[PDB]
Amino acid sequence: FXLF
Amino acid sequence: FXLF
Amino acid sequence: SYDPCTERYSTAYYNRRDVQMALHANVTGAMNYTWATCSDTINTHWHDAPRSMLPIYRELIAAGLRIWVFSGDTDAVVPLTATRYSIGALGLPTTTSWYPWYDDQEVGGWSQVYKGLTLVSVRGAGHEVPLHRPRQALVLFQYFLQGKPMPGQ
Amino acid sequence: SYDPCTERYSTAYYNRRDVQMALHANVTGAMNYTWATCSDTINTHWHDAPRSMLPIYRELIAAGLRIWVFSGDTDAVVPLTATRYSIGALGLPTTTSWYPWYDDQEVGGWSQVYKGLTLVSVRGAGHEVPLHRPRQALVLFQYFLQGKPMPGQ
Amino acid sequence: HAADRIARLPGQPAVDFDMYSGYITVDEGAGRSLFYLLQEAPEDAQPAPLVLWLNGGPGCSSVAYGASEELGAFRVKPRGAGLVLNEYRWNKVANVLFLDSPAGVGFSYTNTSSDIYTSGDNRTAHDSYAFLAKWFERFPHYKYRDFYIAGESYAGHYVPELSQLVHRSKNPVINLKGFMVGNGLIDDYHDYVGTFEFWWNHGIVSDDTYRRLKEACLHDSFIHPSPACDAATDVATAEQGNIDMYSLYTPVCNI
Amino acid sequence: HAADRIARLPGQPAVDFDMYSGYITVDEGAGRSLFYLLQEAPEDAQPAPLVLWLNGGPGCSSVAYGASEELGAFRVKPRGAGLVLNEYRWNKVANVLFLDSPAGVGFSYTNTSSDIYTSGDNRTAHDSYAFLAKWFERFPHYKYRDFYIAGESYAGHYVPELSQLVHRSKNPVINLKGFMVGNGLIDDYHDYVGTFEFWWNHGIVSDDTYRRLKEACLHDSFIHPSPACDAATDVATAEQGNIDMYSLYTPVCNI
Ligand SMILES: NC(=[NH2+])NCCC[C@H](N)C(=O)O
Ligand SMILES: NC(=[NH2+])NCCC[C@H](N)C(=O)O
């Protein structure tokens, strides 16, 4: 906010 | 018969 | 039929009082924050995270566990190529070279069997495989459970 | 709506007597062979074919002609990467770096403007661009005719 | 156990399998408790394996994704109105256990607020291990069952990390048979490499950005990129434009 | 000219633009004549440019592809029953001239049978040039029109090759403004390279085949691969399986  |  | 807005619906739903009731979630109402799909806070305050999982892979492979790695080939966040290279780093031997596996009459993706690990791509699926290729995702899951290679033909 | 069997229909149609009549084709009926989409014979008996078209490109670029190269990014026969590398060989300077172009509110593909040539990818389109992304194919064609860069926003 | 049983969820169609959900405390001292959702296979498929499924993020909920828009039994209707059955639900063949993890994610919670600022792979896993041990004491009919752990994305960490604890734990009740990882972090360096190459081969960045990314990010981790790495990815982002990076050929949600 | 006008094709919907088709002899001695299909823009768009469109193969027909399943005004119904209008037809903005080339392709024909065993880029182009010169004498209202040449695939050869003759020809009547190439052969070496990389990045071949292809084909041309190149591609083919290589995420025709 990075989503894996 | 390869078509680009 | 594909709907990219699923996370919105979910959020609406889980934040419903009755749904939590039914779920037995937030029994006492003390979670005084809206339910969300992810936590930005934790997302943003992450600590430890080793760089490689390979060693664990080596360990568990040696321990004889069943290990399968899969990848939806139209995802760009953690893409197939990243996977191909990472697994490639294990240096395992190949038992069954890259081949097309079929679901019914269609190619569902491809797969390669190494000694100790099976790699499977799911053709046309994004990051959330069972979301974009539900039918194929299930096939994948059934074969893994059986410990059997993805089917050719 | 997409139908992968188009070549079959075509073949049925062009081989119709009335269609040839209307087309003024094979006036006298002397083409005593079935009409086909391609000729395997010529396909298989091809002669001269220089390895690089680059020099022509250099010539015409120098001659000031308008040159645009495009690519449907889900084609695997003459894929985008082949194109990126070939154009890359011209060594031209970049006037406008790789950017997303939009059709309406959606990204239609990307494009890069060099000094003397415009490169355009058409997102999700196979080899036959106007077949798989007809709407976007037309936008591409209109911009090229106008000599204007693919639109951002 | 029976107390965790779900009767019917709002808007739920009627089905032939049971589900359970509830909390398990994984850290008494901190007051950390994880919420789970168990979706069982119908009788005709029993005794089926037990599969622990985990979503990534880190900070994303197994229930929200896994259960709700992926392999789970149902899908939520628009506006969160109700449910539809997932015709390809994985609970057609396994007992699927979805875990919101770590504490703080989904319905999982912590009594120590700072917990949410201190999460890491280690604790995540230890707590998960705890969760399991305890879970099985609550569902003792699952002891000894063939068991698997599976997830996607950041769970490329979680899964094998947990798997290793379980394996090493020498917990007799847990019959761990293996794990499966989908689109998962496996090795930062290689992953970074394959990532950029893939992007360039999908026409999503310029040549220069491809090169800038390789040079900026290669010694970094996905979760903790250097500032060079971030600057580079900011450019890539700009080049990518308004597309869904999790599914390149599908549309972005408009609401 | 008027004689080439088409009145209505079988099954054709009624439209607001004209079309012409017919033959132009490009080699009297050999008895080589090319068939063309001209699909004009409606009045409201005139005087629009003239665009020569060429399909590849080599040996594939501009009418069959270009006109019939691509940018052309219509699409053929199943079983070749009739036509539908292509809502995105390029003749909405240009006068589109489709050429079946070389002689022997489509409706184009040769009186010298061996012609069909001797085709090559050179003759193809010279004949095309001839075709044009002549065509314009038949449609003198097109002289001086802004003119473009465009195509895909093997036409990555044809287009710039023709373009160069036209350019150099110093034919005053032909106002050549440029050309556009789609998915086209541009440079064998680079193309081979990008091809394999792309395939590997789309999960269509093994690592070993990727490597075998690079080593087998790099000094070859697309049209005339070495026997090493072919052996390698036979393996790739086997790895690719039953997919449409011209559109990776679309289905193959079942009839
Ligand atoms: N499409 C998305 N925004 N996905 C975010 C979720 C990714 C996440 N780790 C998962 O477990 O799916
Ligand atoms: N989908 C196919 N089989 N396409 C073959 C045709 C390719 C050809 N050169 C063209 O001009 O389109």
- Determine the distance in angstroms separating the CA of F24 from the nearest CA of chain E, rounded to an integer: 41
**Beta carbons of C100 and F241 less than 8 Å apart:** yes
CB B3 less than 6 A from any atom of ligand 2: yes
Surface of C (67-106) touching F: CB under 8 A: 71, 73-74, 80-81, 84, 88, 97-100, 102, 105-106
Domains C5-44 and C53-147 share a fold: no
- Cis omega (within 30 of 0) for bond into E47: yes
Closest CA relative to residue D116, chosen from D152, D63, D70, D80: D63
Report the C-alpha gap between F180 and F151 in whole angstroms.
7
Is residue E65 part of an annotated ligand binding site? no
The single residue of E62, E108, E128, E153 carrying the catalytic annotation is: E153
The single residue of F101, F108, F153, F163 carrying the catalytic annotation is: F153
Is residue E153 part of an annotated ligand binding site? yes
**Beta carbons of E242 and D81 less than 8 Å apart:** no
Chain centroid, CA C137 distance in Å: 9
Residue E108 structure tokens: 């999982």
Q: Given CATH 6.10.250.940, say whether it is the number of domain C5-44.
A: yes
Which ligand 2 atom lies nearest to the CA of residue F151? Answer: 11
Is E153 tagged catalytic?
Answer: yes
* C-beta separation of E81 from C18 below 8 A: no
**E118-143 core/surface letters (b: 16 or more CB in 10 A; e: else):** bbebebbbebbbbbbbebbeebeebe
CB E57 less than 6 A from any atom of ligand 1: yes
Q: If 0-12 CB within 10 Å is exposed, 13-18 middle and 19+ buried, where does residue E78 land? A: middle
Q: List, comma-separated, the residues after which chain B is broken, a break being a C to N distance over 2.5 A; otherwise answer none.
A: 1
The DSSP 8-state label assigned to residue F117 in this structure reads G
The residues, ordered by sequence, that sit 6+ positions from C51 with a Cβ below 8 Å of its Cβ are: E187, E188, E189, E221
- According to DSSP, the residues that pair with F179 across neighbouring strands are D67, F149
User: For residue A1, what is the nearest residue in chain E, using CA coordinates?
Assistant: E57
Closest CA relative to residue E174, chosen from E182, E162, E185: E162
* The residue count for chain D: 153
Q: Which of E53, E54, E65 to mutate to test the pocket of ligand 1 (most atoms within 8 A of CB)?
A: E65
CB E152 less than 6 A from any atom of ligand 1: yes
User: For residue D38, what is the nearest residue in chain B, using CA coordinates?
Assistant: B3
Q: Which long-range contacts (CB under 8 A, 24 or more apart) does F218-224 make?
A: F218/F189, F218/F192, F218/F193, F219/F189, F220/F188, F220/F192, F221/D49, F221/D51, F221/F188, F222/B2, F222/B4, F222/F185, F222/F188, F222/F191, F222/F192, F223/B4, F223/D46, F223/D49, F223/F58, F223/F154, F223/F185, F224/D46, F224/D49
What's at F250, amino acid-wise? T
**Beta carbons of E21 and C23 less than 8 Å apart:** yes
Which ligand 2 atom lies nearest to the CA of residue B4? Answer: 9
User: For residue E239, what is the nearest residue in chain D, using CA coordinates?
Assistant: D99
Q: What three-state secondary structure class fits D100?
A: strand
So where are chain D's domains?
5-44, 53-147
Is D119 near chain F, with CB under 8 Å?
no
**Beta carbons of C77 and A1 less than 8 Å apart:** no
Distance F197 CA to ligand 2 centre (A): 22
- Residues of D designated catalytic: 75, 127
Q: Which of F63, F152, F243 to mutate to test the pocket of ligand 2 (most atoms within 8 A of CB)?
A: F152
Ligand that lies nearest to the alpha carbon of residue C36, given by its number in the listed order: 1
Report the C-alpha gap between E207 and D32 in whole angstroms.
52
Report the C-alpha gap between C2 and E74 in whole angstroms.
15
- E1-255 folds as Rossmann fold (3.40.50)
Report the C-alpha gap between D127 and F197 in whole angstroms.
17
Chain centroid, CA E115 distance in Å: 19
Give the DSSP H or E segment for C42.
helix C40-44
Q: In chain C, what residues touch E35 (CB-CB under 8 Å)?
A: 25
Q: Solved by what technique?
A: X-ray
CB A4 less than 6 A from any atom of ligand 1: yes
**Beta carbons of A3 and E154 less than 8 Å apart:** yes
Chain centroid, CA E137 distance in Å: 23
Distance E105 CA to ligand 1 centre (A): 13
Q: If 0-12 CB within 10 Å is exposed, 13-18 middle and 19+ buried, where does residue F214 land? A: middle
Question: What resolution does the deposited structure have, in angstroms?
Answer: 2.1
Which ligand 2 atom lies nearest to the CA of residue D128? Answer: 12
What CATH number was assigned to the domain covering residues C53-147?
3.40.50.11320
Please report where in the chains the tokens 């700072």 appear, as a residue. Answer: E114
Is D123 near chain E, with CB under 8 Å?
yes
* The residue count for chain A: 4
Report the C-alpha gap between F14 and F84 in whole angstroms.
10
Residue C31 structure tokens: 């979670």
DSSP-assigned states of every residue in D57-91: HHHHHHTT-EEEEEEETT-SSS-HHHHHHHHHTTT
